[PDB]
Amino acid sequence: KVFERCELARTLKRLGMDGYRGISLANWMCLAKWESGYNTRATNYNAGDRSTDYGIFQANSRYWCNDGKTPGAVNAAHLSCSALLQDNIADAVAAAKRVVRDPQGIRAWVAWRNRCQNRDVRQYVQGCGV
């Protein structure tokens, strides 16, 4: 499923993402935008280390979910990577919450540093009623 902007904003809000570990909804939206373009089926294979990023927040199979084919992989969010390709993003959200409970917080996603950190992210939630 490819979410429309405000549809996603409300979905994330209902899932308890607004202010989770101090992260605003606009930051989560900027992250989802740059990571997957709001596409729940987004996948990106990393030939270099043989891992794959799954779903709307692109969780890496080397550490966050299990797909069985990633060398020396761990499953920190304790989920099958398949769970991160569903239209229902509840599990992807739980995994994203797990990531930010670590010290880096939202900084765990490099794409966030490059295109959301210290930027005007108001546009992601403007007009969505959140």
Swiss-Prot record:
GO terms for molecular function: identical protein binding; lysozyme activity. Pfam families: Lys. It comes from the Eukaryota. Its EC number is 3.2.1.17. It is found in: Secreted. Belongs to the glycosyl hydrolase 22 family. Monomer. This is Lysozyme C.
